Structure formats: C-alpha cells, structure tokens
C-alpha cells in the first residue's frame, strides 16, 4: 500500500472551497479516514468514508471515494481560519484481524483573509522600549499579493502571516522587516 | 486517553532517550510514529498487545518496549541528529478503525549544548499614520536569536489571552541562512482597534515560551543556562 495525497499544500481565501485528492494501489483497501492535526496538536480523526460508501457529507465536509479508480477525496465548504490545520488521508483494509493504516504525507492548508477594500501600505514603528530600534510593518494588503523577500543579508523580510486559527475578527494581511543598517528606509524596505 | 512524556526535550548525541506512551482505553493495538516535513507521519514501532512488538517501517535506530496493556516505551539507545522530531504515540481497538493520537513529544538531538539560546523579544508601537488612516492599531512582536528553532508565541491583553486580530509568521527565519547553526527570529502581528491602543489603562503582552535544556541538565559556560523558560514583551495604550 503506498498513498498519494495532493497537493502538499493548499493555500484557500476564506469563504472558497478547498480539496484534496489522494489515491491508494491496493484494492483490498476497504476504510479511509481523514485525521486534522492543528496547529501545534495531535492528529484527530475528522471523518472517514468506507468501500460500501460513495459520498458523505456533514459540516460542510465532503468526502467522496470512488473505488473503481482507487480514488478519494474530501472537500471543506466556505472555508473558515479554523480550518487551517495540517490533513492526511489513509487507507486501510479493516475489520477478528487488523490491517495497517497507510498515511498520505499529507496537505498543509492555510487559510487567508479575505480582504474586500484592501489598502497596501506601509508603516514605521518604534521599540516600546528603547531608543530607535525600528521595523517596517507592510500591511492592508488582500491575500492573492505575493510578498517579495529580502535579496540582502542585512535586511531581513519576513514571510506574510497566518492568521491564528481561532481569529474571528480584525483579520489582515501583514510582513514585517527589520535591518539593523538604517542606513535603511521603510519606503524601500518590500 | 493517551499520553506522552517528556513532551519536550534537548538531547545529545550519544546519548539515551526514552519516550513513555501510556494509555487509559484499553486498546490493545498502539503504535509510535515520526513526523517530519514533507514525510508525513510514519510507523516507527507497534504493538499488538501487552508482551509483544513489531517493526514498522522506519525501526531503524529505535527499540520498542510493550511490558503492558497500558504502556508502550519508545527507546533511542544512542540518540543522533536524524532522531530530532515530532513523536506521536497512538492506541487503537482490535478489530479498528479510528487511532487515537497522544500530544506530541518534541526531541532535538544536538551535537552540543553550546548553542542553544533563549530568545530576546520586543514589542514595537503601532504607528501614528496607520492609525489616522485606517482608525486600527498594529503591535509587531519580534522573538530574536534563539535555537532550538522551536518556540509559541501567545498575546495577551489585560491579563487573558487573545486570538481575534493576531497573525503569526508561520515558520522562524533563519538569522544567518548561510549556516546549519543559525539562530532564529519569528514575529507575529496583534491588530487592535485605535481606541483600544489609545487607551493607557490597556496593557499588551507578548508571551514566548521557549523549550531548551533542562535542570538536571549539565552546564559549563559564563552565561545563564538556557533553559526551558518564557522570554516577554510589554506594552501599555497610550493616550496620544
């Protein structure tokens, strides 16, 4: 049994679908769950789908299997923050034995705000502590920007967030950098 | 339940590591697994009952104890840097289907202690032109110059944690990427509304736990022992 489980990683806008897609070799596999592991935890199984089984659907999940292709799949509607987990599809037969359960390598999905009015911008912000130590705080900007990197090894650029998962407000996109030069202008800095 | 213990450690090389799984399901089957970026988790060791164990399909390096039901031992005879990662025990009931994961132990292996480092943090003010243009305040956390690379990093408001308005990058950076014994830094983002962060009374917290040695742990050095311990950052509302 080898299982393949596609894409690696899924990066989904709040309120669109997400899928993920996984096969399997062995056509005595009869049982395939789904385990969520979030941020920092332990798997859990989520929901599962058997060979006797062509569709389930509750919470605005969807797992579908179709056994002729050794194919299976599950589908998270209107994605939410709380859904950004890392997610592994198995394969098992099951049933007085038991059978190995066979992970895929899993899909790490992120889920990214969804930003009606954005309004890229960048700001300069002080230590509370001390003196001018500075950073440059990029933000206001919607989730389908792609945010540049550095190039320099005296400028450091921060990839964009993510958004903690049990977020339910003041949802945003944001990167930082920060130099050490300065020497260094925000204006510059992304 | 399942639970794991310790469920975070520094090791060295050479050295030995004994990971404990210990179960109240009464499940026969349990299982110990590694998880690795990009590898998924995979079977290490398992056993089908008190007295027995099998190989997995990774055994290599790793023994597995099963002296009883309830427990399930994980042991690294001669600990080495590959062993470093996120150990997942499981049990599971004869005849299946669902595996019930444990915690999670975290292991870093290294050659040496010297340069574990605990992280230096700071909290940066949001800014007056954010504010005036979009009446919504942005404090940066940044967490600097810490290893192992593994740290959680928490907000606080007024004494109780928060989730609504924080954004955390989703992996360290390295400070020196040009090195495999770079320190690392990770920042994360508090959004608040300008009225909140106007306010003097209001006070903000950023919270990082880091894990590294720890007290029976051995430590020759002219510095303080880095130990497993919270590094934070402070901040009050201002009025203007």
């Known amino acids: 049994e080898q299982v393949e489980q596609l894409p690696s990683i899924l990066r989904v806008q709040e309120g669109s679908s997400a899928s993920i897609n996984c096969s399997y070799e062995?056509?005595?596999?009869?049982?395939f769950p789904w385990y969520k592991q979030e941020p920092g935890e332990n798997p859990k199984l989520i929901i599962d789908?058997?060979?006797?089984?062509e569709r389930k659907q509750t919470q605005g999940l969807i797992v579908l299997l179709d056994k002729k292709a050794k194919r299976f799949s599950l589908h998270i509607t209107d994605t939410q923050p709380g859904d950004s987990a890392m997610y592994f599809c198995?394969?098992?037969?099951?049933?007085?034995?038991?059978?190995?359960?066979?992970f895929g390598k899993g899909t790490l999905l992120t889920v990214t705000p969804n930003i009606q009015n954005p309004d890229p911008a960048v700001y300069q912000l002080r230590d509370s502590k001390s003196s001018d130590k500075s950073v440059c705080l990029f933000t206001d900007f919607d989730s389908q920007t792609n945010v540049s990197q550095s190039k320099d090894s005296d400028v450091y650029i921060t990839d964009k967030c993510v958004l903690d998962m049990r977020s339910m407000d003041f949802k945003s996109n944001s990167a930082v950098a920060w130099s050490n030069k300065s020497d260094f202008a925000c204006a510059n800095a992304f | 339940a399942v639970t794991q213990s310790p469920r975070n450690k520094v090791a060295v090389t050479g050295g030995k590591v004994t990971l404990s799984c210990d179960q109240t399901?009464?499940?026969?089957?349990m299982y110990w697994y590694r998880q690795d970026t990009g590898h998924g988790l995979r079977l290490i060791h398992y056993?089908?009952?008190?007295?027995?164990?099998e190989k997995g399909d990774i055994p290599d390096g790793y023994k597995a104890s099963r002296p009883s039901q309830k427990e399930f031992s994980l042991i690294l005879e001669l600990a080495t840097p590959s062993q470093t990662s996120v150990y997942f025990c499981?049990?599971?009931?004869?005849?299946?289907?669902?595996?019930?994961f444990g915690p999670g132990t975290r292991l870093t292996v290294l050659e040496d202690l010297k340069n574990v480092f605990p992280p230096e943090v700071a909290v940066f003010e949001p800014s007056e032109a954010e504010i005036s243009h979009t009446q919504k305040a942005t404090l940066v956390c940044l967490a600097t110059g810490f290893y192992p690379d593994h740290v959680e990093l928490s907000w606080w408001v007024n004494g109780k944690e928060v989730h609504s308005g924080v954004c955390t990058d989703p992996q360290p950076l390295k400070e020196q990427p040009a090195l495999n014994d770079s320190r690392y830094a990770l920042s994360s983002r508090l959004r608040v509304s300008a009225t909140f962060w106007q306010n003097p009374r209001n006070h903000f917290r950023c919270q990082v736990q880091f894990y590294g040695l720890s007290e029976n742990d051995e430590w020759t050095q002219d510095r303080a022992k880095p130990v497993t311990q919270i590094v934070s950052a402070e901040a009050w509302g201002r009025a203007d």
């Open positions: 056993s089908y009952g008190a007295g027995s164990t």
């Open positions: 399901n009464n499940h026969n089957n």
């Open positions: 499981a049990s599971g009931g004869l005849g299946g289907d669902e595996q019930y």
């Open positions: 789908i058997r060979s006797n089984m």
């Open positions: 062995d056509s005595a596999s009869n049982y």
């Open positions: 198995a394969a098992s037969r099951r049933g007085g034995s038991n059978y190995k359960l066979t």
